[PDB]
Amino acid sequence: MQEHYQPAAIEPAAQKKWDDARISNVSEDASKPKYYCLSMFPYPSGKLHMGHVRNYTIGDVLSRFKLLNGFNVMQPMGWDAFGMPAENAAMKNNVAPAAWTYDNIEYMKTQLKSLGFAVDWEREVATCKPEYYRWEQWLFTKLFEKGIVYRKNGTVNWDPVDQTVLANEQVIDGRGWRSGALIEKREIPMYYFKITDYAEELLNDLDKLEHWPEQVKTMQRNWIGKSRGMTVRFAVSDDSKQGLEGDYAKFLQVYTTRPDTLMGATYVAVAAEHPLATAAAADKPELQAFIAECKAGSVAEADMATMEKKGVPTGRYVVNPLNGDKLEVWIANYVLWGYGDGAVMAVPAHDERDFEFAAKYNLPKKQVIAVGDNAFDANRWQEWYGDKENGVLVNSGDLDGLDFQTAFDAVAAKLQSQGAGEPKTQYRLRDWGISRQRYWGCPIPIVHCEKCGNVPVPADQLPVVLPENVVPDGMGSPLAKMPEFYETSCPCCGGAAKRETDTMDTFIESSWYFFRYMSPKFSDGMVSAESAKYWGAVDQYIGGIEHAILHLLYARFFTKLMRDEGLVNVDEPFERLLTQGMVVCETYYRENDKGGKDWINPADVELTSAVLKADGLPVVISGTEKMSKSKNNGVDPQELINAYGADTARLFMMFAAPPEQSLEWSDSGVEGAHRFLRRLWRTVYEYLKQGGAVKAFAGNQDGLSKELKDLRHKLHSTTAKVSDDYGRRQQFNTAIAAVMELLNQYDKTDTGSEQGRAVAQEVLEAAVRLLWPIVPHICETLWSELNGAKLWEAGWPTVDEAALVKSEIEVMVQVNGKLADLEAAALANIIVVPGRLVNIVV
Ligand SMILES: CC(C)C[C@H](N)C(=O)NS(=O)(=O)OC[C@H]1OC[C@@H](CCCn2cc(CNC(=O)NCc3ccccc3)nn2)[C@H](O)[C@@H]1O
């Protein structure tokens, strides 16, 4: 054993020892209990970043621990390969997106392997391969024939200078983000998943996820957004029926979740597309301009509630069906056509948006809800205005005194008797649009024929292959410009026909890949039935919080789709879910001779102030934020590995913060992690150079010294602490601190005697197994110096409950014949014959 710790000498050999033993290459062996530990697979970006290393180290800690506990552990890895990154890299570099993607995959694979993740590489998938995406084309055709996937015209933001479609996230002040050109709203046919057919299942099944963070579940519930309310029809006043036709001339129908406040409605509001808006804007230009601004908006949903609410009176009136009050109709920008009836009622006394709106326009507020002897101020909003559970109705004639649920029913009966309304369940959830006007994505398996319509490609003709021999030029989606791809024959009638040129939303690949990993070379279906039966669901999923809504919902949806097709037998893909925090770092800048800032990379700055590393001109240290190319503050993990080895990188990431907390880059803390590894190395080297290995202490410990009993207490306390930090808390930094404390006590204990060595052997053999999930290379190497058994069949350390009982302090006591450290406990009820009796001289 070399005296100095040299990670490049040891990490390659340890990796070849794990690979030679095929310990991460698992099969469906019904003899070992399974465990499926999954980290969210990466985009083949080019190179790993520190978020990648944080995530896959967390995955590896948990997989290695469960493996050491005897589980058949599958930890798979692959590549979320489609999407815009490669398309833009292709445009800028004059290279095919596929060629760029496959080179990135090859490089990033090398990096992952060198970090020593215990990954089953025989299960690798790449989603841009036809061996992969044919199976989502297959599922699509099945759901298309069932109406679960359907085609319908929708509205997109068209950028006419860049000749491509943009999401609302890419529209700033009505303009394209790169081009700066005004976007055009266009109606085009697109494809949708009927996810709203499964809304109630997706909402309720969340309740089975006892090992999910409540915040993720609550975020899903808000997105689905179920409400039970009331449809209410307000009759249109005779004076307001001009330009209306059909049911819109007779009534304005609305949806509300608060029918118990219908006596408090002081006005109604309609979307800009609503026929009432159209009819009243006919002669009023300010209304026309307000309607146009609403249509031109591109407010992303994450920003919807933040937009400033605005409205315009129409001069048309409807009649409240419970009290006959005539309310003015307003066009408002927060009422969205396609949600419900595109019209709402407004109660400023008990809904805060209605309060702020009515306060803006001086619209009236009528209190109808009381909560205790609380005063009602019509000019200031108090939180109890919105209380549903503890309110009672006031100012509502027949309904005064009722609580929420009784009044809801009373209103329902009143409205139904009248023909004016009925209970109604609604969901904020929209159907899922999967059409993308992009080249680098999975082709949609549809052929368009003027005789037969939109026809699915039959199963025998899948995949529809995306041609890899393409270089996007910017001027529009390539597939629409390639007759060699879209010109075909109709599979139903044989006649002239055209393939669909839109590709799929890339969320589709990531909605089922965890099942594909179960049988990644299966060519007769999405996932083999035998391997789905064995692996079941993912036991532990690890990933970033930005995927808590869309990706998770989509995966849960696809799992229930696949379940209903007969392919899988679970309701939920993910049992345990762990959300890792961001990785952030200091920023540095010089100022520009244009009044701006040039963001410098940390690698080219030295500290003391701070300046360049090759130069000496100072920089300006500024704030800490998530690593990103925007402020040039990303720290390249390959240079951290080059400088210190993989074990140091993995230890720093786990020690620096709990996985949920944001991790702050620290040169100082990276050096602390390395020196701790050096210390682990030296501790074992020094122990072995003073006598060589011995049989680890085991068994009855009566007759060990006090000092060595104490070390065994700390030893077995550490084992239970660590096990509970890996298994229960998932708090890997406290488990490292625990092992450091154990080595501190060992450093202060004399282990020179014969029984001393046996306890030191025990301590050290436990320490390196306890830390093997975090830094497996050095622990594998040191374990081989201490003990000749395979580390992984030695298995996780066991707690010795005997070493936790602390030995008895037993004696009797007597005041006047009749029944410092003992005289202090025995006065808590003065001779003291050593050990047996305490006599208290009365
Ligand atoms: C399931 C599927 C939908 C997954 C999809 N393929 C995906 O999200 N794929 S992915 O590849 O994005 O990530 C894969 C996983 O692992 C990394 C996690 C990173 C969180 C963000 N995050 C980033 C950072 C720190 N950033 C850096 O170090 N930037 C360095 C840099 C600077 C300058 C230029 C280049 C690089 N901290 N947290 C991420 O949530 C996820 O769990």
Ligand SMILES: [Mg+2]
């Ligand atoms: Mg359960």
Ligand SMILES: [Zn+2]
């Ligand atoms: Zn045809």
